[PDB]
Symmetry: C3
Amino acid sequence: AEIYNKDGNKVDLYGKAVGLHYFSKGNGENSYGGNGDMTYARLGFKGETQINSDLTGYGQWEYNFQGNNSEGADAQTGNKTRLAFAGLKYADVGSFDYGRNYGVVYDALGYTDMLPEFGGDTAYSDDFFVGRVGGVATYRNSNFFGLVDGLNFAVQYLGKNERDTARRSNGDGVGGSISYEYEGFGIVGAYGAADRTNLQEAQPLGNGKKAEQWATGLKYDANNIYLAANYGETRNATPITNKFTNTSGFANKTQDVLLVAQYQFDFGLRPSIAYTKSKAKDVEGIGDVDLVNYFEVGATYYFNKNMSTYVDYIINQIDSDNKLGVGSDDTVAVGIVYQF
Amino acid sequence: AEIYNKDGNKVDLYGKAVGLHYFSKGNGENSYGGNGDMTYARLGFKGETQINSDLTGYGQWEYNFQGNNSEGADAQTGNKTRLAFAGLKYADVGSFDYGRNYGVVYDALGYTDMLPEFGGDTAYSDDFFVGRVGGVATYRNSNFFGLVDGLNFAVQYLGKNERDTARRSNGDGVGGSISYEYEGFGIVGAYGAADRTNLQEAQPLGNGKKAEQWATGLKYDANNIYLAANYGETRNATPITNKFTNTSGFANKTQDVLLVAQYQFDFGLRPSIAYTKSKAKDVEGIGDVDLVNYFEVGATYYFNKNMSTYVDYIINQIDSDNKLGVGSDDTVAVGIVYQF
Amino acid sequence: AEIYNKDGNKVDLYGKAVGLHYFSKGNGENSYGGNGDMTYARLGFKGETQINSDLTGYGQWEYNFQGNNSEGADAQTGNKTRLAFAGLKYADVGSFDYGRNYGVVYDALGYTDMLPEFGGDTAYSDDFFVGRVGGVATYRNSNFFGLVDGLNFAVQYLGKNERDTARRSNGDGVGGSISYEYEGFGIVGAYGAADRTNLQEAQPLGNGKKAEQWATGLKYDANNIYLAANYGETRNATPITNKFTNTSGFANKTQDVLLVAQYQFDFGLRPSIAYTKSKAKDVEGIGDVDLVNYFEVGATYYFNKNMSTYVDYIINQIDSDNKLGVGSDDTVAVGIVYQF
């Protein structure tokens, strides 16, 4: 909501409350998304200030508050800042921001990250360029300097983040993306590469000094229809766990595909169908193994721009024999959302 | 404060800062409420959107920020989300919300939870139906489908929350409440029952597979007067500790009474008197033992709807011999509050 | 931003997003400010309500959200409430607030805490009267009861805070400050003294039962110029670490000086030069040793009241032989800030 607009500065305070539950058999330990209460809230602000006719400054901060914790010792489980960045945008020259922000490969992966609750499986947080990540400098360009309608490109530098776990760490790297959109159609490519830290190199799973991620997308978003596909591959980038040996690391190689189809009826119903598969290769001790493999059926009803509910069912196709011990059971999410 | 109201959606951003101190003898270790700085702040939003003439959607999120922690290693002690839920309300049919919300037995216990700082002793957080708790689905009905002025009822399902401590866990359960209010008078009953988790069943204190809580209330709230009483009992629900053996569990049985009387002078003074007693029975190794036993005198002055101060004194009647090692000393709280 | 103003109550919701990076050689382990992403955000509210013609009530809460953490296990590192207090102000009689607030010796140290990113080295958090601290009661007086233009004084009681570390603890104490400002000139003195806790007395570094801090300031702030100096000394108050022995405590004695000079050009550039030196004496096993010793050059450009960027370079003069193992390398910070 726009809670302040004066002197060329406008501020957006936003947020939501999501009542959310997952249903899966038994513990949910052997399932796609687990089991139980998953309620949470969000709070964020995004600001935009007019410095002059050609120059705008902006910033944004976004936080996640889990609402499925006690008020006791686990009160903080899963809380975090999601975004925190400030930047400048000039004319048709381009924009630059720094902070915690989306890695550039998400420019492609965004095409399919459209499911009510699940999906966007390969867009991992703190995983180089595929998702939200800290210390990223990003240059963006709209309509090629104002010369080409619908053509955008982006260049991003990722600072080194040496953390106490290999999962959330990374070395220095560079990536970029390019996209063209014309009258309903969208196409996008993105690539990123970066050094791995010594801690990542010390993990049992994943072998190499460099990490690489890329992905391409096609979409059609005209009127009430939404169709999109993504394809991508990664080297030493995708985080994995062997539940049998309690071993952790990254996948030497992955190949992923994501498809989504949805339709928005004017009366508020938005049915959804999707497919996602992420395969890993050359995993030490395992070889080839599916990481994600499922169909999705679901729907969201929008009462309005502020209220909605949704069901999201995961027809999980990972088999009970999966060599990594990836969960084989289905998961369904039901939720009710208030946002401003 | 209503910081946004447009297009049928209104948003309330609220919060307060409370400068608060407790005074009790010595360490305060042997006292009712402890000793020292107890300053804190709150932040929350509650939203309400008009979907149509008969349908409203709504959500709310509420957080506690302790202000008596250092900026160091204890920076987070006692911080938590208090409420996080969204729901729909239709005509006279009723309302439904899901998320972290008040257990239905609080519909009764609310009558006496009216003291400036203390009181509401049996309304434990994450304790089934008596207080705030996660994963609760709640149906509410006002004026019996629009047919009976002042008659309300509520039905609530509590999802299982299997946490890492028995204190904050619970199994599946169902509860409800009914209340009738007419011209100053209020009466209310509520009951709740639920399964206990294996972790709760493994604790030294408390024996049984089921937990049960109920309570009834009477109140008079006309003009400047406020009088209210609560009575209630619980089985395997009330959390307790034996300080001698450092043993923890739940009370097999409790019987509780809460009384409050207050008067609001037009010039802003609101004097308060209260009595609270919570007895436990069949406690392993102990038998019968008082958990809470005190009189309360205190007062709040309201400078206005935004500013107030208060003193709250606890005449603690727990004896120095208390078999559980419950604190025997008095406690007084003094506070100054800014809220919006 | 003033997001609500009605019925004599005005509320300020403010905050910022700061994209921030530090550059220092190698690990940055041997440097002044370290190395890497240092992005963060702030959120706070400050409220002011008219109780009557002579009486205003007020409160404020301020929180720090680090934006250089993963969304994983370190998600919370460095997050905290900075301020949380409420108070009343009456006529020319004075104001009183309680909560987490600035220690009174900061009334002096504020003169030089003016650098873009660094500086204000001796204003430690949770360090008695020099910085933000919990459970402080503060009386302030403006213009000597309305009798003396520019003369202010303050008296502050510090409640005991017995925490789990000696660093963030303190005993009871009292301090005050006095300041006089006339047409660009400012002068200020402040003193504070307090008991030390048993935990502080048990630390290897620092010997004594009492802690003491004082400081004086002179400044000139007319037009576009800013000049200020501070001098101060402390006993058993300044927190220190011996990196060689991994020993911790407080400095028996410190003597500190802080100088700053800045100029604000009308077109938005604000160049900055500074000097800071903090020496410790009678440190067990060491004797005399510099804690801080550097020159600062830097600048901030203000695009407007909402947008800015800055570079801050620390010419670190601590030598590589420093007996405490204080970092000897330089550090430069670059940042881009959006605030409302």
